Swiss-Prot record:
PROSITE patterns: GATASE_TYPE_1. It comes from Pyrococcus horikoshii (strain ATCC 700860 / DSM 12428 / JCM 9974 / NBRC 100139 / OT-3). The keyword GTP-binding does not apply. It catalyses: XMP + L-glutamine + ATP + H2O = GMP + L-glutamate + AMP + diphosphate + 2 H(+). Pathway: Purine metabolism; GMP biosynthesis; GMP from XMP (L-Gln route): step 1/1. This is GMP synthase [glutamine-hydrolyzing] subunit A. The keyword ATP-binding applies. Catalyzes the synthesis of GMP from XMP. Its EC number is 6.3.5.2.
């Protein structure tokens, strides 16, 4: 399917695209400020809200959520994208303890999907410069780490997913497979 990646300015955005391309998925990176009508014309079968340095630069990602019925496809937020989803849906985001990137062990408490067929525990590449501190209503925790309770989440009714870490970075164990599982929700 056509998976649209909304670029929030993050350093790893091109790795999202290259991973999907390796998997044979049709995908395009677009500016986060792309007008909604132009996004709709791309006929997205899925949308990814990429990482980026700041919640002050999320463009039309919240607008897509506001207009979710016009898209009605799976959405994955990565880091900033996970955080902006959490804020939109009524959770809380705040500064975390460790801003520097590192490999962190997570436990998947609900395989669901993005973690389908994968080990229960994974080492993932991530920062906690910011973090989802309080789960939005109508969401479920999918994964946690020793000190971060909400490493991944999903809406309980809609196919809207968030991960704090970067599956597009190869240091992340099974990162490619997480993105493949998401792509499979979108079709093919
Ligand atoms: Cl990024």
């Amino acid at each position: 399917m056509m998976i649209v990646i909304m670029d929030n300015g993050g350093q790893y955005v091109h790795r999202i695209w290259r991973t999907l391309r390796y998997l044979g998925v049709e995908t395009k990176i677009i500016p986060n400020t792309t007008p909604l009508e132009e996004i709709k014309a791309m006929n997205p079968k899925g949308i990814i809200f990429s990482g980026g340095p700041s919640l002050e630069n999320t463009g039309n990602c919240e607008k897509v959520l506001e207009h979710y019925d016009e898209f009605n496809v799976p959405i994955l937020g990565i880091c900033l994208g996970h955080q902006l989803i959490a804020k939109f849906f009524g959770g809380k985001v705040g500064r975390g303890e460790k801003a520097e990137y590192s490999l962190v062990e997570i436990e998947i408490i609900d395989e669901n999907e993005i973690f389908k067929g994968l080990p229960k525990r994974l080492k993932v590449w991530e920062s906690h410069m910011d973090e989802v501190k309080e789960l939005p209503p109508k969401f479920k925790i999918l994964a946690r780490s020793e000190t971060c309770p909400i490493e991944a989440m999903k809406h309980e009714e809609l196919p809207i997913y968030g991960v704090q870490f970067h599956p597009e970075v190869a240091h992340t164990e099974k990162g490619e497979e997480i993105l493949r599982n998401f792509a499979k929700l979108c079709g093919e």
